[PDB]
Design a protein around this nucleic acid. Structure first.
Lengths: 147, 186, 52, 48, 125, 51, 123, 52
RNA sequence: AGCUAAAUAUUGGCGAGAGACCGAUAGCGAACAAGUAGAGUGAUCGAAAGAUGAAAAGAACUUUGAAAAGAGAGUUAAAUAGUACGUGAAAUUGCUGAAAGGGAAGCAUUGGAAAUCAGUCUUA
RNA sequence: UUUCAAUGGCCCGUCUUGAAACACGGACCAAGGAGUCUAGCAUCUAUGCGAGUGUUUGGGUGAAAAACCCAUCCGCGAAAUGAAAGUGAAUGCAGGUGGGAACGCCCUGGCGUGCACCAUCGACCGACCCGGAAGUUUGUCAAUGGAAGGGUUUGAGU
RNA sequence: AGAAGCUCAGACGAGUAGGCAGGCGUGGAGGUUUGUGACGAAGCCUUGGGCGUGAGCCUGGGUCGAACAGCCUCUAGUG
RNA sequence: AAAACUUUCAGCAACGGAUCUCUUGGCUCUCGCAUCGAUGAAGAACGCAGCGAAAUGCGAUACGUAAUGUGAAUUG
């Protein structure tokens, strides 16, 4: 809406909110990020450190598809199952343990943040962190590595 | 004339919600009466928190309510929990305890999990009848400074705050002023 | 004036369904109907349901 | 929950009745409808 | 309301069509109703006007006037009726044009083409 | 110039872009055209499956 | 829904019986007693209320109930007076003594002025 | 009912859609305020419009 | 060495439909006899300009004048619509009435004088 | 309303330390005439959902460029860290200390309890500087591997 | 007691550049008003009258000839 | 210190063409279509009507001929 704008409240005031001394000119400081090492250096080096220069090695034809590895933590493993599976298996001793294939859920690694209940469970995953698998083992579960 | 330091010092308060929600206006009317006609400092707090904005009323979760209500030393286990705001769900907690929570809004998952676990969900007006003076109530708040903006607020030299970068990566504000090898580290 | 002004504005589907549900509920309240302007002072019932 | 009567072709009341749907218990939000109506009514404008 | 996508609801285009219509179209634009007797006898609601038709003025300052159609002045959308004249200042008589929709036909000029028109438009002759 | 909080601007708008702007006002018209062609094909090739 | 939310929706700003001006608004509600826009005096916004209007030398009074609020045709009941202004005042506060009495003064004013309207019409 | 569902069961014709829940349960504040629960605890009603 | 529909583009042309657009200093340069009239050797440049009334019924006739016209009359619902035509603003101008004015005027406050006017009461 | 009297009253707009200026622009009048739009970004506000979220690229449907409905993707978020190879967040009630909202209790205070927030002390994850235990096979002595533990340094972390 | 209401009390009042709030007026859109109008809409002129601190609004008289407005909201080539 | 003159105000008459209302126009979006030329195109010149200069149409068969449809005009 233009009927609740500030150009509707400066009708009558000469300079239109930009001052009489300094005025509103086209580009008194340059266009864009120009001058970030000469006269915008105070802004750049205070609010955007690291902006200039090279870091690290240079990689050609990077493709994110072979690097795709979203991660899941331990406390979200049981949430990855349907509610019927959870009600069937949590807290009840069964000779068969549930299988949680994290690849189907869309993850490439099981991380170790959080805790697990005292029910054995099979975790099918591509990767697993060191103490994530230790927690699963100590909770009674097992980690089966898939391709 | 008079030598006065400051002139017409308006308070930084809100006298009414900026929301147009008619039901929120009704809750404001009820709690304005309760605060005005009772000495309940609780009712004054609820009226103040009804006026507050969205960012000043962050969500709280089922687990956080469970954590704050099941402390060892505190015996505030059966007391009704009060939040002026939403009560989101925490799926990371596989088993939900029995909780009696009154809040403005409940997410569908949180409300279903509470009622399935055996507790109850109340509105602020319903708690205005069960505990009109707020006796035996645990008034709690969400972590207000958990927003993304507070990652950046106060940015400057040696403040360890997040910058506004269009893309997190290696070629994006990591060299001059971010490592001692490139001139200086700030 | 340019044609690439934004003429259509996006609304969340859930909010649209919220507004439909509110508008249907209001249509069931006789007092709002009289306010809206409909001459229903002698309508047999609100909501008005008629045979198939 | 309450029920509503069904009126015939001649306006008389029929024996059969229908339970009131739950949508007639939903909150009534004038501000939300105004904001959504304001936006939706713009979705059939032609450019000029 | 119209539902055809080939018919124009634009006030602009309708007014251009009316005022740019050729003679063969103004022939049908200038149609007049039939009287009670002709309507019940021919089963025709209205027919286009034609020279030498015997019609009666229905509206206007010349309401109730009687006369034959001397000339259908198509390009101005006006009908000139006999004995329907106006007196100029110098004493000369100027025929006064009457719109087609403001008259009623009380006797047609029956030709074989007009008879075919009547029987074609769901009528009887 | 640059004195406000937020990202450093990156607007690739230094060419003559207004000549090559593409609007989508024919989005329903294209959608209807595809269906009519789709229904024409189904009627033309019936009884065999469309896809 | 409830009377409060009904008033919040209608009343306040938009209604077919609202007449706003410079800074004052009138309630043309044919069920309002005082003609003022209020919770106290808008029978659309609140539960059972009274009102009175004029016709052809006599007056009629509208009344309401609660359980029948879902039937607009038979929600509202009319009682007719064609005897006297003093008797009309007697009828109104008699039909409001067992009722919320806040409307007795405002109603009796409406009756007595409408009767003055009739006398001035005759004169 | 199938179009809109209820506030606790999915609408059949709108997948995974539940009717919205209100932030206030009882919307009649006057009777809620004037109920015995509130009037039996509020401090003594102070004066209305005050003499100067 | 080679061919190949569909999905794709479309400030041109042809034909349709619309529009939270513009409404005659606006919208195309052009609502009209507009790429016209006009300008430059040329390449080129390029306007201004819509509206009597329902219908011309566009003012017969007499009279003054050399005439243009005027005054009568007549037409019309109306000429306070007469083609120098709907409405007809401000700048500027003439006439009339009122008042002021000794090298500026205009303006503010307060009252006199002159002009003008309403409330109020009259009643209950 | 006009006019007279007494009193006061410089010509506005402008840049300027300073304009009645012998500084600029302005003879008058009518109509036109200058912070807009879009791709983003940042604070603040409102609304819907909420560990999720986003129907509108498309499909269905609608006699109709609207509305309505829907599949599979995908964008952002749910994990950081390093230049990388890579590793990847619970000693504890997800921890102590101080101030604290709200409530309870006791005879104005006192005792318990501590939400949000900041001061702060520690733990965890990664990088860096050490440190070389299992295990793995392949060179066993070696190759590979990198747990325990140590820093009181580092990150836009838990 | 248009609770967005009502009521009591005290203190205070300069302002350029600049900020913010609430209002006034213009063109178009959805809703609304048993809305105004050829028995005269809009527009225009006015030594008439009324309202507001003001932007502005209302009205009497004259002229005129076909449309136009109040309230809630939407929008912008809006002073 | 009267008139004239100068200025202000009002009525009326001028000058001027603003305002209001309209609009066979423009602008924008959408939809459908594929069709120029050596078988002489686009464009140009000059002509053609009973009374025509322009615009529109046409080409010495010249505001047009044949053919088809409609069915009684054209019009100053």
């Amino acid at each position: 809406p233009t009927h609740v704008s500030k150009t509707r409240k400066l009708r009558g005031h000469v300079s239109a909110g930009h001052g009489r001394i300094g005025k509103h000119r086209k580009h008194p400081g340059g266009r864009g990020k120009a001058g970030g090492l000469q006269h915008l250096r105070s802004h750049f080096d205070k609010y955007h450190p690291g902006y200039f220069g090279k870091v690290g090695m240079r990689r050609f034809h990077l493709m994110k598809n072979p690097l795709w590895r979203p991660t899941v933590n331990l406390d979200r493993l049981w949430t990855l199952l349907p509610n019927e599976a959870r009600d069937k298996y949590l807290g009840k001793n069964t000779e068969v343990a549930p299988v949680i294939n994290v690849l189907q859920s869309g993850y490439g690694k099981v991380l170790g943040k959080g805790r697990l209940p005292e029910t054995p469970v099979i975790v099918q995953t591509r990767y697993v962190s060191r103490r994530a698998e230790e927690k699963i083992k100590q909770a009674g579960g097992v980690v089966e590595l898939i391709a | 004339g008079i030598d006065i330091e400051r002139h017409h010092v308006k308070k930084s308060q809100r006298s009414k919600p900026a929301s147009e929600n008619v039901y929120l206006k009704l809750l404001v009317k009820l709690y304005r009466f309760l605060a005005r006609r009772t000495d309940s400092r609780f009712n004054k707090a609820i009226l103040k928190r009804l006026f507050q904005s969205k960012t000043n009323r962050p969500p709280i979760s089922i687990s956080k309510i469970a954590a704050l209500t099941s402390r060892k030393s505190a015996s505030s286990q059966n007391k009704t929990t009060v939040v002026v705001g939403t009560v989101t769900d925490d799926e990371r907690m596989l088993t939900v305890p029995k909780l009696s929570i009154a809040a403005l809004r409940f997410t569908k998952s949180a409300r279903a999990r509470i009622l399935k676990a055996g507790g109850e969900v109340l509105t602020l007006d319903q708690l205005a009848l069960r505990a009109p003076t707020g006796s035996n109530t645990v008034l709690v708040r969400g972590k207000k400074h958990a927003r993304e903006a507070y990652r950046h607020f106060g940015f400057g030299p040696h403040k360890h705050k997040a910058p506004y970068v269009r893309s997190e990566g290696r070629k994006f504000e990591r060299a001059r002023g971010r490592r001692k090898s490139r001139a200086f580290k700030v | 004036t340019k044609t690439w002004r934004k003429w259509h504005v996006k609304v969340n589907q859930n909010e649209k369904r919220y507004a439909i549900a509110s508008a249907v509920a209001a249509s069931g309240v006789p007092s709002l109907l009289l306010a809206r302007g409909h001459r229903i002072e002698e309508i047999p019932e609100v909501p008005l349901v008629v045979d198939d | 929950r309450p029920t509503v009567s069904i009126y015939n072709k001649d306006g008389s009341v029929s024996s059969e009745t229908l339970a009131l749907p739950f949508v007639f218990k939903a909150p009534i939000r004038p501000d939300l409808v105004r904001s959504v109506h304001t936006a939706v009514a713009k979705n059939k404008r032609q450019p000029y | 309301m119209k539902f055809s996508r080939d018919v124009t609801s634009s006030r602009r285009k309708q007014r251009k069509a009316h005022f740019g219509a050729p003679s063969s179209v103004r022939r049908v634009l200038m149609s007049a109703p039939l009287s009670k007797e002709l309507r019940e006898q021919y089963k025709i609601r209205s027919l286009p006007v034609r020279r030498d038709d015997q019609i009666t003025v229905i509206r206007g300052s010349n309401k109730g006037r009687e006369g034959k159609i001397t000339s259908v002045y198509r390009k101005k959308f006006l009908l000139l009726i006999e004995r329907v004249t106006r007196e100029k200042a110098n004493g000369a008589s100027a025929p006064v044009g009457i719109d087609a929709s403001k008259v009623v036909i009380t006797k047609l000029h029956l030709d074989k083409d007009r008879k075919d028109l009547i029987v074609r438009k769901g009528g009887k002759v | 110039a640059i004195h406000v909080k937020g990202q450093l601007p990156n607007a690739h708008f230094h060419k003559d872009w207004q000549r090559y702007v593409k609007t989508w006002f024919n989005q329903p018209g294209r959608k209807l055209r595809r269906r009519q062609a789709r229904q024409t094909k189904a009627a033309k090739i019936a009884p065999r499956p469309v896809e | 829904q409830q009377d409060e939310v009904i008033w919040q929706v209608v009343g306040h700003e938009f209604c077919s019986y609202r007449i706003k001006g410079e800074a004052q608004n009138f309630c043309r509600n044919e069920y309002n007693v005082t003609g003022l826009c209020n919770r106290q005096s808008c029978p659309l916004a609140n539960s059972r209320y009274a009102t009175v209007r004029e016709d052809n030398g006599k007056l009629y009074l509208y009344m309401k109930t609660i359980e029948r609020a879902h039937f607009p045709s038979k929600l509202w009941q009319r009682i007719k007076l064609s005897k006297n202004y003093a008797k009309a005042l007697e009828q109104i506060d008699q039909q409001l003594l067992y009722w919320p009495g806040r409307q007795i003064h405002r109603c009796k004013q409406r009756l007595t002025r409408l009767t003055q309207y009739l006398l001035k019409a005759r004169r | 009912d199938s179009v809109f569902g209820s506030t606790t069961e999915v609408a059949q014709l709108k997948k995974n859609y539940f009717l919205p829940e209100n932030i206030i349960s009882n919307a009649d504040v006057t009777r809620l305020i004037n109920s015995d629960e509130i009037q039996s605890i509020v401090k003594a009603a102070g004066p209305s419009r005050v003499k100067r």
